[PDB]
Write a protein that binds this DNA or RNA. Structure first.
Ligand SMILES: Nc1ncnc2c1ncn2[C@H]1C[C@H](O)[C@@H](COP(=O)(O)OP(=O)(O)OP(=O)(O)O)O1
Ligand SMILES: [Ca+2]
Ligand SMILES: [Ca+2]
Ligand SMILES: [Cl-]
Ligand SMILES: [Cl-]
Ligand SMILES: [Cl-]
Ligand SMILES: [Cl-]
Ligand code: NA
Ligand code: NA
Ligand code: NA
Ligand code: NA
Length: 326
DNA sequence: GTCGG
DNA sequence: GCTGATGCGC
DNA sequence: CCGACGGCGCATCAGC
């Protein structure tokens, strides 16, 4: 793509700062910069040009001049050659191993996939599952498969209670031809901001999906959020489908629109929408949009009857899901 | 790392 | 058990 | 020119 060399470079720097440096604000700075550059409609030809964009400052502008002049960045060349950094970065690819766990593993001499398998006893349950399906979770999911997955989830939810509504969100809802995983937003009329009239609404759905062997493992699970693993059924003598990551959020039925806005993403789109909201004097989460007071305290939830309502409050033109991708 | 209080 | 902090993740 | 940057669920640990 246009400016892909530059946005690749900045994404790699972002990942180095989060995973190795543990500098989460530099991670965010690089991600914002990558994002704005990715949506910039001209081929960037100097650092000075790039510096005019919001989120690009002096330091990223120098890097862009170096990349443009040379087709590489010396900082990144040195990072790539650093075995310890590469091992730390690599270990974070495992679900359940973040930057802190990865550094401790590498410090203890665990630097490779083989090292992890020989040291399963040092891993928690989440990390064990992450390791077990490491190869599978690196793969993306074709939209054709996401459609078969949607069909199974929606059917099984219907069988538990026809009053449930399940909506497949994330990249899928944004129209992507492939997805990293499956995110399902769940609502039921017995769960609203005003009451919990039935117990175990999420649990009921999870156990039915387990019963039919669609959900195969659990990474975490509470009353509102399930994080786990699932798999499509496959035909005789045919290779198995990869195991996939699945997340299910149960949101109060009356907060559906803030819910689907959040769960539709992208992640960068949400953080920029929420930042804009803040400077328009609002705070947004997956439940509500509320006005900000002088103390800093959030007011009461504002009425919302559509995704577009949320955009209107902060004076954004509506963006369809497909225009919320990076 | 960037931008603003 | 709790509150608060951290780690991991959406 | 130093300090703030979306927002939150679940799991685990520290210090009660
Ligand atoms: N840091 C964050 N802040 C706000 N919202 C987030 C954040 N991370 C994830 N989300 C929201 C937006 C995401 O689209 C949604 C589902 O997350 P996730 O599955 O991780 O990514 P995704 O569906 O956008 O892309 P992918 O195809 O890689 O899964 O949750
Ligand atoms: Ca997803
Ligand atoms: Ca997800
Ligand atoms: Cl930082
Ligand atoms: Cl479970
Ligand atoms: Cl809503
Ligand atoms: Cl709220
Ligand atoms: Na700038
Ligand atoms: Na990880
Ligand atoms: Na169907
Ligand atoms: Na199996």
């Amino acid at each position: 793509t246009l400016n892909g060399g530059i946005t690749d470079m900045l994404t790699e720097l972002a990942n180095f700062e989060k995973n190795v440096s543990q500098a989460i604000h530099k991670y965010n700075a690089y991600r914002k910069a990558a994002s704005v550059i990715a949506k910039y409609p001209h081929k960037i030809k100097s650092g000075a040009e790039a510096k005019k964009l919001p989120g690009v400052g002096t330091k990223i502008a120098e890097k862009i001049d170096e990349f443009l002049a040379t087709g590489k960045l010396r900082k990144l060349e040195k990072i790539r050659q650093d075995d310890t950094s590469s091992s730390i970065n690599f270990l974070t690819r495992v679900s359940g191993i973040g930057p802190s766990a990865a550094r401790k593993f590498v410090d203890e001499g665990i630097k490779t996939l083989e090292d992890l398998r020989k040291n399963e006893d040092k891993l928690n349950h989440h990390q064990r599952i992450g390791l077990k399906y490491f190869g599978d979770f690196e793969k993306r999911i074709p939209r054709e498969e996401m459609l078969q997955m949607q069909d199974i989830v929606l059917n099984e939810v219907k069988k538990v209670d026809s009053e449930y509504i399940a909506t497949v969100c994330g990249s899928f809802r944004r129209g992507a031809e492939s997805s990293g995983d499956m995110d399902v937003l769940l609502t039921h009329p017995s769960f609203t901001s005003e009451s919990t009239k039935q117990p175990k609404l999420l649990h009921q759905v999870v156990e039915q999906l387990q019963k039919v062997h669609f959900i195969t493992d659990t990474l975490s699970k509470g009353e509102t959020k399930f994080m786990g693993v699932c798999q499509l059924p496959s035909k005789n003598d045919e290779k198995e489908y990869p195991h996939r990551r699945i997340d299910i959020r149960l949101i109060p039925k009356d907060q559906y629109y803030c819910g689907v806005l959040y769960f539709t993403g992208s992640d960068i789109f949400n953080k920029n929408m929420r930042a804009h909201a803040l400077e328009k004097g609002f705070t947004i989460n997956e439940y509500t949009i509320r006005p900000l007071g002088v103390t800093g305290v959030a007011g009461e939830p504002l009425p919302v009857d559509s995704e577009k309502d949320i955009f209107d409050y902060i004076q954004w033109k509506y963006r369809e899901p497909k225009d919320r991708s990076e």
